[PDB]
Symmetry: D2
Subunit: 132 residues, 4 copies
C-alpha cells in the first residue's frame, strides 16, 4: 500500500482514432499547474533519481515504453508504462527513477504545482533521513 | 492578424534527451483545466470541424504531423504542426479542422476549461451567423 | 511520364495489428540486395539530393511523414508519404530529395544493388549534364 | 548455445539524423528474398508462436520496444529490442514469440526466403516432436 495508483483512462474510439480527456480533480486527483514532457530518450541513459515532499504527478507514456521504479523508503515497486490509455499517479514523499526508455520514447507528466528546484531531493540518503 | 499564435518552446537538452515544461499563465496564456490527446489517427480520416465561443487551446504535435486549418469568418490559415517543441495557440471564436494526420500521429491539446458539448459549434453556417 | 510508381500494399490485419510482406520480383519489382533506414529526422534538416544511373529503390515511411521531391531534369513532383501501407518506387536517372520530415520520422529503403558511393550524383548541375548527353 | 545472435549496427550520424545500411552476406548473413513489417501492435496482444526448419530471419525494432522470447526445445531466452541500432538474428529450428509490444511499436524482419505457410510450425507440441526425432 504505497502512494501510487494505476489510472485506466476511458477513450472515445471512432474511425478517426482515439481521444482521452483528463480534467482537474476528476481523472486527475489534483489541479494541473504545469505539464512537461520528455522525448529523445535512450535505453542506456535513465532519468529521474529524485523525490518531492508536496508535488504530486500523473505520468502518461505518449510513445514507447519505460520502467518507472518507485521507492517510499522501504519496499520498492517497478511499474512498466507502455500505452497512452494508462497513467501512473505518483503521490508525496516518493522516490522515482525512469529507466529502459525505448529509443525516442515520449513521456508526459501532469504536475500539481509550478517548477520548484529547491523542493527536489536529488540525494537518496537525504530522502531516507526525511522519510524517518 | 487572426487570434492564433505559434509558440516556440525552450527545451532542457542533455544526454538523457529533451524536456519541455509548460506552466499556467506563463508558456500557456491561460490556466489548464483539462488536457486531452488524440492518437491512432489516419491521413484520410480528418478531425475537428468546430468552433468555440470562450474556450482557448494550445495544440502540441507529440508524434507525427498534421495540418491545422483555422478560420475566423473571413480569410483562413493552414498551419502544419510536426515537432514537439512548437505549440499552436488557438483563441476564441475560431473554426479549426485537423487533416493529413500522419498514420498514428499523436496530438496533445491543453484546454482553458472543462469539456462542454453545448458550447461546441459543429455547423459552419451557424459559426458564420455567430461571427456576424 | 516520370519513372516513379505509387505502390499500394495489402496488409494482413487482426486484433494484434497489421503485417505487410514484400518479396523479390513480386511486390518489389527487383531483387533486394540492401535495405537502409533513416531515423532521428528533423523538419528543418532535409535529406537526399542525389541521383543514380542504375540503382532502383522502393521508399516506405514506417513512422511519421515526409515529402519526397522527384526531378528527372524537368519540374519537381512532390509525393507525400504519411502511412506505412504505401510505398514509392523510384527508377533510374531520378534526382530525389526528402524534406518536411515529421520529428523522429523513420524511412525504410529497399535497394536493387550494393552501396556504391562512386555511382552517386550529389550535384544537381552534374545530374542535368548527365541527363542532357 | 541457442542459434540467435545480437547484431550491433554502425549508424552514419549527422545533424539530419541516423542511417543504418544492411547488405546481403555482409551485416545480414543470408540473401534477403523478403522483408515484412508489423505495426498497430498492443502490449496485451502478443505475436509469433511459430518455428521454421529452414527460414533464417533478422529482427529490428524500428519504433518502440518488444520482448522476443526464443525457445529451441529447452528454456525460454528473453531478448529485449528497444532501439533501432540493434538487430536479432534467429537461426533454424527456433520457436519464437514477441510480446510486451509498446503501443504502436513497429518490427522489421529481413527473411532468407519467400513466404511458405506450409513450412510454418504454429503448434509448440509439434515443434518439440520435430526437435526430438
Ligand atoms: C520538470 C522540470 C525540469 N526543468 C529542468 C531542470 C533540469 O535542469 C532539466 C532536467 O530536469 P531533470 O529533473 O533532470 O529531469 P528528469 O525528471 O527527467 O530526471 O529541466 C525545468 O526547467 N522545469 C521543469 O518543470
Ligand atoms: C475534447 C473532448 C471530447 N470528448 C468526446 C466528444 C466526442 O464524443 C468524442 C470525440 O470528440 P470530437 O469533438 O469529435 O473530436 P475532434 O476535436 O478530434 O474532432 O470525444 C469528451 O468526452 N471530452 C473532451 O474533453
Ligand atoms: C544509403 C547508404 C548510405 N551510406 C552512408 C553515406 C553517407 O556517408 C551517409 C549518409 O547517406 P546520405 O546519402 O547522406 O543519406 P540520404 O540519402 O538520407 O541523404 O550514409 C552508407 O554507408 N551506405 C548506404 O547504403
Ligand atoms: C510473415 C508473413 C505473413 N503473412 C500472413 C500470414 C498470416 O495470415 C498473417 C499474420 O502472420 P503471422 O504469422 O500471424 O504473424 P506474426 O509472425 O507477427 O505472429 O500474415 C504473409 O502473407 N506473408 C508473410 O511473409
Ligand atoms: C496501493 N496501490 C496498490 C493502489 C498502489
Ligand atoms: C497574428 N499572428 C500573425 C501572430 C497570428
Amino acid at each position: 500500500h504505497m502512494d501510487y495508483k494505476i489510472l485506466n483512462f476511458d477513450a472515445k474510439n471512432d474511425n478517426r482514432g482515439s481521444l482521452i480527456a483528463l480534467e482537474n480533480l476528476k481523472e486527475i486527483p489534483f489541479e494541473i499547474k504545469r505539464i512537461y514532457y520528455i522525448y529523445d530518450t535512450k535505453p542506456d541513459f535513465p532519468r529521474g533519481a529524485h523525490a518531492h515532499k508536496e508535488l504530486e504527478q500523473v505520468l502518461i507514456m505518449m510513445d514507447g515504453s519505460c520502467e518507472i521504479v518507485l521507492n517510499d523508503g522501504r519496499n520498492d515497486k517497478s511499474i512498466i508504462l507502455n500505452r497512452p490509455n494508462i497513467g501512473l499517479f505518483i503521490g508525496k514523499n516518493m522516490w522515482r527513477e525512469m529507466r529502459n526508455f525505448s529509443y525516442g520514447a515520449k513521456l508526459l507528466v501532469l504536475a500539481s504545482d509550478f517548477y520548484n528546484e529547491n523542493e527536489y531531493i536529488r540525494d537518496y540518503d537525504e530522502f531516507l533521513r526525511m522519510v524517518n
